[PDB]
Amino acid sequence: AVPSVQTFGKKKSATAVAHVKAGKGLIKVNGSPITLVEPEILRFKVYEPLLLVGLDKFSNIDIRVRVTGGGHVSQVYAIRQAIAKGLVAYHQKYVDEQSKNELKKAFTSYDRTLLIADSRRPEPKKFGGKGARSRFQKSYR
Amino acid sequence: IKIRITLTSTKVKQLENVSSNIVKNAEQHNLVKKGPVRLPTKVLKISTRKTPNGEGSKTWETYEMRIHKRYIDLEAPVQIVKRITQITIEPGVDVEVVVA
Protein backbone atom coordinates (compact mmCIF):
# COMPACT_ATOMS: atom_id res chain seq x y z
CA ALA A 1 0.00 0.00 0.00
CA VAL A 2 1.50 3.30 -1.15
CA PRO A 3 1.48 6.03 1.54
CA SER A 4 -1.30 8.46 0.67
CA VAL A 5 -3.55 11.00 2.40
CA GLN A 6 -6.67 12.95 1.44
CA THR A 7 -7.39 16.49 2.63
CA PHE A 8 -9.28 19.63 1.60
CA GLY A 9 -9.02 23.39 1.51
CA LYS A 10 -12.08 25.58 1.95
CA LYS A 11 -13.15 29.19 1.46
CA LYS A 12 -16.48 31.02 1.19
CA SER A 13 -17.67 28.47 -1.38
CA ALA A 14 -14.45 27.04 -2.86
CA THR A 15 -13.56 23.41 -2.08
CA ALA A 16 -10.16 22.06 -3.14
CA VAL A 17 -9.78 18.34 -2.48
CA ALA A 18 -6.12 17.31 -2.32
CA HIS A 19 -4.67 13.83 -2.76
CA VAL A 20 -1.10 13.71 -1.43
CA LYS A 21 1.13 10.71 -2.17
CA ALA A 22 4.79 9.72 -2.00
CA GLY A 23 5.97 10.66 -5.50
CA LYS A 24 8.75 12.54 -7.29
CA GLY A 25 7.97 15.99 -5.89
CA LEU A 26 5.27 17.61 -8.03
CA ILE A 27 2.20 19.79 -7.48
CA LYS A 28 -0.74 19.88 -9.87
CA VAL A 29 -4.23 21.40 -9.75
CA ASN A 30 -6.99 20.04 -12.02
CA GLY A 31 -4.18 18.42 -14.01
CA SER A 32 -2.36 21.76 -14.32
CA PRO A 33 0.90 22.62 -12.54
CA ILE A 34 0.86 25.06 -9.65
CA THR A 35 2.63 27.56 -11.93
CA LEU A 36 -0.45 28.07 -14.16
CA VAL A 37 -3.24 29.35 -11.96
CA GLU A 38 -2.61 32.63 -13.84
CA PRO A 39 -3.57 35.58 -11.68
CA GLU A 40 0.18 36.43 -11.68
CA ILE A 41 -0.30 37.67 -8.10
CA LEU A 42 -2.48 35.05 -6.45
CA ARG A 43 -0.01 32.74 -8.21
CA PHE A 44 2.63 33.87 -5.73
CA LYS A 45 -0.09 33.77 -3.07
CA VAL A 46 -0.41 30.02 -3.69
CA TYR A 47 3.38 29.75 -3.99
CA GLU A 48 3.46 31.08 -0.40
CA PRO A 49 3.29 27.72 1.48
CA LEU A 50 5.90 25.94 -0.63
CA LEU A 51 8.30 28.89 -0.51
CA LEU A 52 7.74 29.55 3.20
CA VAL A 53 8.40 25.95 4.22
CA GLY A 54 11.14 25.32 1.65
CA LEU A 55 10.97 23.10 -1.43
CA ASP A 56 13.10 20.47 0.32
CA LYS A 57 9.92 19.39 2.14
CA PHE A 58 8.38 18.44 -1.24
CA SER A 59 11.25 16.15 -2.22
CA ASN A 60 9.11 13.05 -2.76
CA ILE A 61 5.50 14.28 -2.59
CA ASP A 62 3.00 14.50 -5.45
CA ILE A 63 -0.10 16.60 -4.79
CA ARG A 64 -3.23 16.54 -6.96
CA VAL A 65 -5.85 19.21 -6.27
CA ARG A 66 -9.38 19.14 -7.69
CA VAL A 67 -11.07 22.51 -7.23
CA THR A 68 -14.78 23.33 -7.36
CA GLY A 69 -16.81 26.37 -6.46
CA GLY A 70 -16.24 30.00 -5.56
CA GLY A 71 -14.60 32.72 -7.63
CA HIS A 72 -10.94 32.85 -8.55
CA VAL A 73 -9.64 34.38 -5.31
CA SER A 74 -11.54 31.91 -3.14
CA GLN A 75 -10.35 29.03 -5.33
CA VAL A 76 -6.72 30.10 -4.98
CA TYR A 77 -7.01 30.46 -1.20
CA ALA A 78 -8.67 27.05 -0.97
CA ILE A 79 -5.84 25.60 -3.08
CA ARG A 80 -3.14 27.03 -0.83
CA GLN A 81 -4.92 25.86 2.32
CA ALA A 82 -5.43 22.40 0.81
CA ILE A 83 -1.79 21.93 -0.16
CA ALA A 84 -0.51 23.23 3.19
CA LYS A 85 -2.89 21.03 5.16
CA GLY A 86 -2.09 18.05 2.94
CA LEU A 87 1.63 18.42 3.57
CA VAL A 88 0.90 18.76 7.29
CA ALA A 89 -1.30 15.64 7.27
CA TYR A 90 1.34 13.66 5.37
CA HIS A 91 4.02 14.67 7.86
CA GLN A 92 1.65 13.78 10.71
CA LYS A 93 1.00 10.34 9.22
CA TYR A 94 4.58 9.39 8.35
CA VAL A 95 7.13 12.06 9.29
CA ASP A 96 8.34 12.80 12.83
CA GLU A 97 5.75 14.52 14.99
CA GLN A 98 8.37 17.09 16.00
CA SER A 99 8.95 17.88 12.32
CA LYS A 100 5.20 18.16 11.76
CA ASN A 101 4.95 20.48 14.77
CA GLU A 102 7.71 22.81 13.55
CA LEU A 103 6.23 22.68 10.04
CA LYS A 104 2.79 23.80 11.21
CA LYS A 105 4.34 26.28 13.67
CA ALA A 106 6.14 28.03 10.81
CA PHE A 107 2.92 27.87 8.78
CA THR A 108 0.85 29.48 11.55
CA SER A 109 3.57 32.05 12.23
CA TYR A 110 3.41 33.22 8.62
CA ASP A 111 -0.39 33.06 8.32
CA ARG A 112 -3.13 31.51 10.44
CA THR A 113 -5.33 30.83 7.39
CA LEU A 114 -3.06 28.19 5.78
CA LEU A 115 -4.44 25.48 8.10
CA ILE A 116 -7.66 26.95 9.54
CA ALA A 117 -10.65 27.53 7.28
CA ASP A 118 -12.16 31.00 7.43
CA SER A 119 -15.22 31.64 9.58
CA ARG A 120 -16.60 34.69 7.73
CA ARG A 121 -19.81 33.27 6.45
CA PRO A 122 -22.11 35.50 4.37
CA GLU A 123 -24.87 37.27 6.26
CA PRO A 124 -28.30 36.50 4.77
CA LYS A 125 -30.14 39.36 3.12
CA LYS A 126 -33.30 40.52 4.85
CA PHE A 127 -36.37 42.14 3.33
CA GLY A 128 -36.45 45.91 3.17
CA GLY A 129 -32.93 46.20 1.77
CA LYS A 130 -30.66 45.07 -1.05
CA GLY A 131 -28.18 43.52 1.39
CA ALA A 132 -27.67 42.04 4.84
CA ARG A 133 -27.64 45.43 6.58
CA SER A 134 -28.23 48.09 3.92
CA ARG A 135 -31.83 49.33 3.82
CA PHE A 136 -33.39 50.90 0.75
CA GLN A 137 -33.91 54.64 1.38
CA LYS A 138 -35.98 56.59 3.91
CA SER A 139 -37.89 59.42 2.21
CA TYR A 140 -40.17 61.78 4.14
CA ARG A 141 -40.90 64.67 1.75
CA ILE B 1 -34.18 -7.73 -9.57
CA LYS B 2 -32.99 -4.62 -7.71
CA ILE B 3 -36.21 -3.06 -6.50
CA ARG B 4 -36.11 0.40 -4.94
CA ILE B 5 -38.34 1.94 -2.28
CA THR B 6 -38.34 5.74 -2.20
CA LEU B 7 -39.75 7.62 0.79
CA THR B 8 -40.83 11.20 0.11
CA SER B 9 -42.00 12.52 3.46
CA THR B 10 -41.81 15.83 5.33
CA LYS B 11 -41.82 14.59 8.94
CA VAL B 12 -38.19 13.67 9.55
CA LYS B 13 -38.86 11.62 12.71
CA GLN B 14 -41.50 9.38 11.15
CA LEU B 15 -39.44 9.06 7.98
CA GLU B 16 -36.40 8.06 10.05
CA ASN B 17 -38.28 5.44 12.05
CA VAL B 18 -39.87 3.90 8.96
CA SER B 19 -36.46 3.76 7.28
CA SER B 20 -34.90 2.22 10.40
CA ASN B 21 -37.53 -0.49 10.79
CA ILE B 22 -37.42 -1.28 7.06
CA VAL B 23 -33.64 -1.65 7.03
CA LYS B 24 -33.68 -3.75 10.20
CA ASN B 25 -36.45 -5.93 8.73
CA ALA B 26 -34.35 -6.53 5.62
CA GLU B 27 -31.41 -7.22 7.96
CA GLN B 28 -33.43 -9.92 9.71
CA HIS B 29 -34.70 -11.23 6.35
CA ASN B 30 -31.11 -11.48 5.01
CA LEU B 31 -31.57 -9.15 2.04
CA VAL B 32 -28.75 -7.57 0.04
CA LYS B 33 -29.13 -3.80 0.03
CA LYS B 34 -27.43 -0.44 0.17
CA GLY B 35 -28.09 1.94 3.02
CA PRO B 36 -30.87 4.51 2.94
CA VAL B 37 -29.52 7.17 0.61
CA ARG B 38 -30.76 10.54 1.87
CA LEU B 39 -31.12 13.05 -0.94
CA PRO B 40 -30.71 16.74 -0.06
CA THR B 41 -33.79 18.23 1.56
CA LYS B 42 -35.95 20.20 -0.87
CA VAL B 43 -37.42 23.37 0.61
CA LEU B 44 -40.57 24.83 -0.94
CA LYS B 45 -40.46 28.50 0.02
CA ILE B 46 -43.06 31.21 -0.52
CA SER B 47 -42.22 34.83 0.26
CA THR B 48 -45.41 36.74 1.06
CA ARG B 49 -46.19 40.22 2.32
CA LYS B 50 -47.73 40.02 5.78
CA THR B 51 -50.31 42.72 5.12
CA PRO B 52 -53.39 41.82 3.06
CA ASN B 53 -53.52 45.40 1.79
CA GLY B 54 -50.57 47.57 0.76
CA GLU B 55 -50.24 49.73 3.87
CA GLY B 56 -47.43 49.76 6.41
CA SER B 57 -43.74 49.00 6.38
CA LYS B 58 -42.80 46.52 3.67
CA THR B 59 -42.45 43.38 5.79
CA TRP B 60 -42.32 39.86 4.37
CA GLU B 61 -42.45 36.31 5.63
CA THR B 62 -41.09 33.12 4.07
CA TYR B 63 -42.99 29.87 4.56
CA GLU B 64 -40.79 26.81 4.02
CA MET B 65 -42.12 23.29 3.50
CA ARG B 66 -39.25 20.82 3.87
CA ILE B 67 -39.37 17.61 1.83
CA HIS B 68 -37.06 14.82 2.96
CA LYS B 69 -36.41 12.15 0.32
CA ARG B 70 -34.78 8.78 0.99
CA TYR B 71 -34.36 5.68 -1.12
CA ILE B 72 -33.25 2.13 -0.35
CA ASP B 73 -32.50 -0.48 -3.00
CA LEU B 74 -33.43 -4.05 -2.08
CA GLU B 75 -33.32 -7.44 -3.78
CA ALA B 76 -36.09 -9.72 -2.52
CA PRO B 77 -38.92 -11.89 -3.84
CA VAL B 78 -42.13 -10.09 -4.69
CA GLN B 79 -44.07 -11.67 -1.81
CA ILE B 80 -41.56 -10.36 0.75
CA VAL B 81 -41.44 -6.98 -1.04
CA LYS B 82 -45.23 -6.72 -0.79
CA ARG B 83 -45.08 -7.78 2.86
CA ILE B 84 -42.43 -5.11 3.46
CA THR B 85 -44.67 -2.48 1.88
CA GLN B 86 -47.72 -3.64 3.85
CA ILE B 87 -45.85 -3.59 7.18
CA THR B 88 -44.44 -0.51 8.93
CA ILE B 89 -46.73 2.23 7.65
CA GLU B 90 -46.56 5.67 9.29
CA PRO B 91 -49.14 8.26 8.16
CA GLY B 92 -47.63 11.26 6.40
CA VAL B 93 -44.70 9.22 5.06
CA ASP B 94 -45.43 8.27 1.46
CA VAL B 95 -43.65 5.27 -0.02
CA GLU B 96 -43.38 4.12 -3.62
CA VAL B 97 -41.60 1.19 -5.26
CA VAL B 98 -39.86 0.92 -8.63
CA VAL B 99 -37.37 -1.45 -10.27
CA ALA B 100 -33.90 -0.23 -11.28
Binding site: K24, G31, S32, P33, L36, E38 | -
Partner: protein, 143 residues
Protein backbone atom coordinates in the same frame (compact mmCIF):
# COMPACT_ATOMS: atom_id res chain seq x y z
CA UNK C 1 6.94 13.84 -17.25
CA UNK C 2 5.30 14.70 -20.56
CA UNK C 3 3.95 17.84 -22.25
CA UNK C 4 0.37 19.08 -22.36
CA UNK C 5 -1.68 22.19 -22.92
CA UNK C 6 -2.50 21.66 -19.26
CA UNK C 7 1.15 22.34 -18.45
CA UNK C 8 1.32 25.18 -21.02
CA UNK C 9 -0.25 28.58 -20.31
CA UNK C 10 -3.55 29.52 -21.94
CA UNK C 11 -3.19 32.75 -23.92
CA UNK C 12 0.23 31.96 -25.38
CA UNK C 13 -0.78 28.47 -26.48
CA UNK C 14 -4.03 29.63 -28.06
CA UNK C 15 -2.09 32.34 -29.89
CA UNK C 16 0.50 29.80 -31.09
CA UNK C 17 -2.16 27.34 -32.27
CA UNK C 18 -4.07 30.13 -34.01
CA UNK C 19 -0.87 31.21 -35.75
CA UNK C 20 -0.25 27.61 -36.85
CA UNK C 21 -3.79 27.20 -38.18
CA UNK C 22 -3.67 30.54 -40.01
CA UNK C 23 -0.27 29.73 -41.53
CA UNK C 24 -1.62 26.44 -42.87
CA UNK C 25 -4.96 27.85 -44.04
CA UNK C 26 -6.71 24.54 -44.75
CA UNK C 27 -9.64 25.13 -42.38
CA UNK C 28 -12.38 26.07 -44.90
CA UNK C 29 -13.26 29.51 -43.54
CA UNK C 30 -17.01 29.96 -44.23
CA UNK C 31 -16.63 33.24 -46.13
CA UNK C 32 -19.26 35.23 -44.24
CA UNK C 33 -16.52 36.20 -41.78
CA UNK C 34 -15.45 39.87 -41.79
CA UNK C 35 -19.16 40.69 -41.38
CA UNK C 36 -20.51 39.32 -38.09
CA UNK C 37 -19.77 40.50 -34.55
CA UNK C 38 -19.32 36.92 -33.19
CA UNK C 39 -22.36 37.53 -30.94
CA UNK C 40 -25.49 39.57 -30.47
CA UNK C 41 -23.85 41.02 -27.36
CA UNK C 42 -20.65 42.30 -28.92
CA UNK C 43 -21.08 45.74 -30.46
CA UNK C 44 -18.17 45.42 -32.93
CA UNK C 45 -16.55 42.64 -34.96
CA UNK C 46 -13.08 41.40 -33.97
CA UNK C 47 -10.22 43.84 -34.40
CA UNK C 48 -7.94 41.56 -36.46
CA UNK C 49 -10.12 41.10 -39.54
CA UNK C 50 -7.93 38.78 -41.62
CA UNK C 51 -7.82 36.35 -38.70
CA UNK C 52 -9.76 35.87 -35.43
CA UNK C 53 -11.32 32.74 -36.88
CA UNK C 54 -8.16 30.73 -36.30
CA UNK C 55 -8.14 32.27 -32.81
CA UNK C 56 -11.72 31.12 -32.21
CA UNK C 57 -10.80 27.71 -33.63
CA UNK C 58 -7.77 27.39 -31.35
CA UNK C 59 -9.85 28.42 -28.34
CA UNK C 60 -12.57 25.90 -29.20
CA UNK C 61 -10.09 23.08 -29.80
CA UNK C 62 -8.31 23.71 -26.50
CA UNK C 63 -11.65 24.00 -24.69
CA UNK C 64 -12.76 20.65 -26.11
CA UNK C 65 -9.44 19.12 -25.04
CA UNK C 66 -9.79 20.44 -21.49
CA UNK C 67 -13.37 19.20 -21.25
CA UNK C 68 -14.77 15.93 -22.60
CA UNK C 69 -17.67 17.04 -24.83
CA UNK C 70 -19.21 20.46 -25.45
CA UNK C 71 -21.85 21.66 -27.87
CA UNK C 72 -23.04 24.74 -29.73
CA UNK C 73 -25.08 25.98 -26.77
CA UNK C 74 -22.12 25.52 -24.45
CA UNK C 75 -19.91 27.54 -26.79
CA UNK C 76 -22.55 30.27 -27.10
CA UNK C 77 -22.73 30.51 -23.32
CA UNK C 78 -18.95 30.47 -22.93
CA UNK C 79 -18.13 33.09 -25.56
CA UNK C 80 -21.07 35.28 -24.57
CA UNK C 81 -20.64 38.30 -22.35
CA UNK C 82 -22.30 41.24 -20.68
CA UNK C 83 -24.29 43.30 -23.19
CA UNK C 84 -24.73 47.06 -22.74
CA UNK C 85 -28.52 47.31 -23.09
CA UNK C 86 -28.53 51.10 -22.97
CA UNK C 87 -30.02 52.51 -19.77
CA UNK C 88 -30.92 48.96 -18.70
CA UNK C 89 -28.56 46.91 -16.50
CA UNK C 90 -26.04 44.61 -18.12
CA UNK C 91 -26.85 40.95 -18.69
CA UNK C 92 -25.21 37.82 -20.03
CA UNK C 93 -25.81 37.20 -23.74
CA UNK C 94 -24.79 34.20 -25.82
CA UNK C 95 -22.30 34.31 -28.68
CA UNK C 96 -22.93 33.74 -32.41
CA UNK C 97 -24.48 30.31 -32.77
CA UNK C 98 -23.60 30.19 -36.46
CA UNK C 99 -19.96 31.16 -35.82
CA UNK C 100 -19.50 28.56 -33.09
CA UNK C 101 -21.35 25.88 -35.07
CA UNK C 102 -19.29 26.47 -38.20
CA UNK C 103 -16.00 26.49 -36.30
CA UNK C 104 -17.15 23.13 -34.94
CA UNK C 105 -17.88 21.95 -38.48
CA UNK C 106 -14.45 23.06 -39.71
CA UNK C 107 -12.71 21.34 -36.80
CA UNK C 108 -14.77 18.24 -37.59
CA UNK C 109 -13.65 18.31 -41.22
CA UNK C 110 -9.99 18.67 -40.23
CA UNK C 111 -10.54 15.95 -37.63
CA UNK C 112 -9.61 17.88 -34.49
CA UNK C 113 -13.12 17.23 -33.10
CA UNK C 114 -15.63 14.45 -33.67
CA UNK C 115 -19.37 14.06 -33.05
CA UNK C 116 -19.62 12.12 -29.82
CA UNK C 117 -22.52 9.93 -28.62
CA UNK C 118 -25.06 11.54 -26.30
CA UNK C 119 -24.70 14.65 -28.46
CA UNK C 120 -21.93 17.25 -28.50
CA UNK C 121 -18.44 17.16 -29.95
CA UNK C 122 -15.54 15.36 -28.27
CA UNK C 123 -11.83 15.56 -28.98
CA UNK C 124 -10.45 13.15 -31.56
CA UNK C 125 -7.23 11.14 -31.43
CA UNK C 126 -5.56 13.21 -34.14
CA UNK C 127 -6.67 16.37 -32.35
CA UNK C 128 -5.08 15.06 -29.16
CA UNK C 129 -1.87 14.34 -31.06
CA UNK C 130 -1.84 17.71 -32.78
CA UNK C 131 -2.50 19.86 -29.71
CA UNK C 132 0.08 17.94 -27.69
CA UNK C 133 2.52 18.52 -30.55
CA UNK C 134 1.91 22.28 -30.45
CA UNK C 135 2.43 22.24 -26.68
CA UNK C 136 5.73 20.40 -27.14
CA UNK C 137 6.79 22.83 -29.88
CA UNK C 138 5.94 25.79 -27.65
CA UNK C 139 7.97 24.48 -24.73
CA UNK C 140 10.92 23.43 -26.90
CA UNK C 141 11.03 26.81 -28.65
CA UNK C 142 10.46 29.23 -25.75
CA UNK C 143 12.79 27.43 -23.32
Amino acid sequence: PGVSVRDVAAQDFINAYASFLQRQGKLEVPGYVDIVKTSSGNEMPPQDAEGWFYKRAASVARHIYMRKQVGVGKLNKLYGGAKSRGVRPYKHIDASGSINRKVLQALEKIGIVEISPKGGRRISENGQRDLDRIAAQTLEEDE
